[PDB]
């Protein structure tokens, strides 16, 4: 059942293999959802606080620990029985990934304890949801949870794509410098609506008696592949004018000189609409609801002018069997002006 219970620099982390194509000894320019370089990453941690965070366009997640506190995640919208939600939980032997109409707890967790104080026999109480009805997807595989664990979560094109990397580091309070690309872990053919997520923690009872979250953005990256096809470096093309130059020249080095790398353009701040100040409506109804229509050989022509034409009244009507527009979109008609209209 349910039980009631800072920022750091992203540096150059959060880069993953954008596709499943082998490349080597080459600089490849790719546009994808990446964690921007030197971005603001939120740092999360007696008290308990494990908040539900927005997913936005995708999430960069990382944690440093030897205690295996982070066990899984919940992804979804309402995170209740009203909608489908994705549950990812890792245990000692397997990872369980399910999509169900879960009724999640406000403070979901796995309660860790030693069975009758046998330290060689650990057990856990699964307290994440109260129900899991109408499951549409289930997947079970090998588990993937000083030790820095990085993940990238994308929800796109019918797939929930997870990338990961596991490396040792010599710091706790922040993310490491240097470059390491995350490799695709699993592509889940789920196809659900995700706007929010939260981390599932393993909590020893004695704890109540850290991880980093960044967001992905549509950015252009220049990725450097070494001879073994490993991504060893990258340039965030929108980070600064130098990175922009590097991407323009398709190189990680720039020679002395002046380069044209982009175009500067002042953007509009307002939309100014100026139409003739008339209120009289165009007499379309008088055409459509005429008692008598002409024969096609002697068709009638009504000239319409100097009026306001609301075409959505006609288009959104259930009474017409045919409504075909040529040279113009039926949904853009109310934004257009004409010199004349013939009916």
């Amino acid at each position, epitope marked *: 059942q349910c039980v009631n219970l800072a920022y750091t620099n992203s540096f150059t982390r959060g880069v993953y293999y954008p596709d499943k194509v082998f490349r080597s000894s080459v600089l490849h320019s790719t546009q994808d959802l990446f964690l921007p370089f030197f971005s603001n990453v939120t740092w999360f941690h007696k008290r308990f606080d494990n908040p539900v965070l927005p997913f936005n366009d995708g999430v960069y997640f990382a944690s440093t620990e030897k205690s295996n506190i982070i066990r899984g995640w919940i992804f979804g919208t309402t995170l209740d029985s009203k909608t489908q939600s994705l549950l990812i939980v890792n245990n000692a032997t397997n990872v369980v990934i399910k999509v169900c109409e879960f009724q999640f707890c406000n403070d979901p967790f796995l*309660g860790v304890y030693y069975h009758k104080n046998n330290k060689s026999w650990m057990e856990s109480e699964f307290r994440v949801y109260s129900s899991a009805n109408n499951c549409t997807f289930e997947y079970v595989s090998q588990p993937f949870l000083k030790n820095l664990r990085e993940f990238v979560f994308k929800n796109i094109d019918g797939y929930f794509k997870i990338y990961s990397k596991h490396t040792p580091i010599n710091l706790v309070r922040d993310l490491p410098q240097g470059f390491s690309a995350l490799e695709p872990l699993v592509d889940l053919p789920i196809g659900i609506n995700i706007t929010r997520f939260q981390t599932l923690l393993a909590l020893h009872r004695s704890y109540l008696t850290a991880y980093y979250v960044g967001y992905l953005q549509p950015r252009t990256f220049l990725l450097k592949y070494n001879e073994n096809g490993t991504i060893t470096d990258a340039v965030d093309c929108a980070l600064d004018p130098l990175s922009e130059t590097k991407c323009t020249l398709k190189s990680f080095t720039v020679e002395k000189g002046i380069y044209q790398t982009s175009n500067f353009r002042v953007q509009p701040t307002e939309s100014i609409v100026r139409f003739p100040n008339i209120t009289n409506l165009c007499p379309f109804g008088e055409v459509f609801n005429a008692t008598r229509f002409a024969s096609v050989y002697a068709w009638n022509r009504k000239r319409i002018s100097n009026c306001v034409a609301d075409y959505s009244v006609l288009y959104n009507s259930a009474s017409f069997s045919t409504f075909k527009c040529y040279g113009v979109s039926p949904t853009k008609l109310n934004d257009l002006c004409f010199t004349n209209v013939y009916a």
Partner: antibody, heavy 121, light 100 residues
Framework: VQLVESGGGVVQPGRSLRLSCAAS????????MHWVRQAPGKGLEWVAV????????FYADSVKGRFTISRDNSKNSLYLQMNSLRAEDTAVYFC?????????????????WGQGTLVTV | YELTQPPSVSTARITCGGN??????VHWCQQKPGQAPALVVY???DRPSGIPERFSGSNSGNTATLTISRVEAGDEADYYC???????????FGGGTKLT
């Protein structure tokens, strides 16, 4: 360590009764508490448990939705509000101090029992 | 979840059955006539201060036992078997076994 129940008595079916228990001899705010009832001629039947901080309240299936367990750490006292009492609820009600159960994450057994107060419906 | 134990026992041994009870911690309390229950054994075989070494127990398979050696007339009480059911967050009591 002592626990004293009060607020018992005789009521008719459909009416409510509030019980209370005064705790002393220990730091009340550091322990969870139980209510247990014993009908005449019967064994012990568990009613409810509340955590030391009052954040978590669990109830027996037979009383869930009718009985409310609460605590007041400032006054070192435990309360049980019993609504819609029925003839089947006749029993001696005990308050007791909880003790951690080694086979569960946050399970409890019972250490110290009060003398109990009789409730007749 | 429920416990099963005999109405009475005449070394006295009080059995407490259940479904793979080995995985659950069994606790025992003693209730004398006209008195409140008191904890005698917890976590299968541990004793609280004040309880004589005569009180021991075990938990294996589908049964748990409270063993009382050198039984005295002062032990004529109702002994209850209880566990915590983590599946429903309830304390489960057995019927209670009377000694004579």
């Amino acid at each position: 360590v002592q626990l004293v129940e009060s607020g018992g008595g005789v009521v008719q079916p459909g009416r409510s009764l509030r019980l209370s228990c005064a705790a002393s001899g220990f730091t009340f705010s550091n322990y969870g508490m139980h209510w247990v009832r014993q009908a005449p001629g019967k064994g012990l039947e568990w009613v409810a448990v509340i955590w030391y901080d009052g954040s978590n309240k669990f109830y027996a299936d037979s009383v869930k939705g009718r009985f409310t367990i609460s605590r007041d750490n400032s006054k070192n006292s435990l309360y049980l509000q019993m609504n819609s009492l029925r003839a089947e609820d006749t029993a001696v009600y005990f308050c007791a101090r909880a003790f951690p159960d080694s086979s569960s994450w946050s399970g409890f057994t019972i250490d110290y029992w009060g003398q109990g107060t009789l409730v007749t419906v | 979840y429920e416990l099963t134990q005999p109405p009475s026992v005449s070394t006295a041994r009080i059995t407490c059955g259940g479904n793979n009870i080995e995985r659950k911690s069994v606790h025992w309390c003693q209730q004398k006539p006209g008195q409140a229950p008191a904890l005698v054994v917890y976590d299968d075989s541990d004793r609280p201060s004040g309880i004589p070494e005569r009180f021991s127990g075990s938990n294996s398979g589908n049964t748990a036992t409270l063993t009382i050696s050198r039984v005295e007339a002062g032990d004529e009480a109702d002994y209850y078997c209880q566990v915590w059911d983590s599946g429903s967050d309830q304390v489960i009591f057995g019927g209670g076994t009377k000694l004579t």
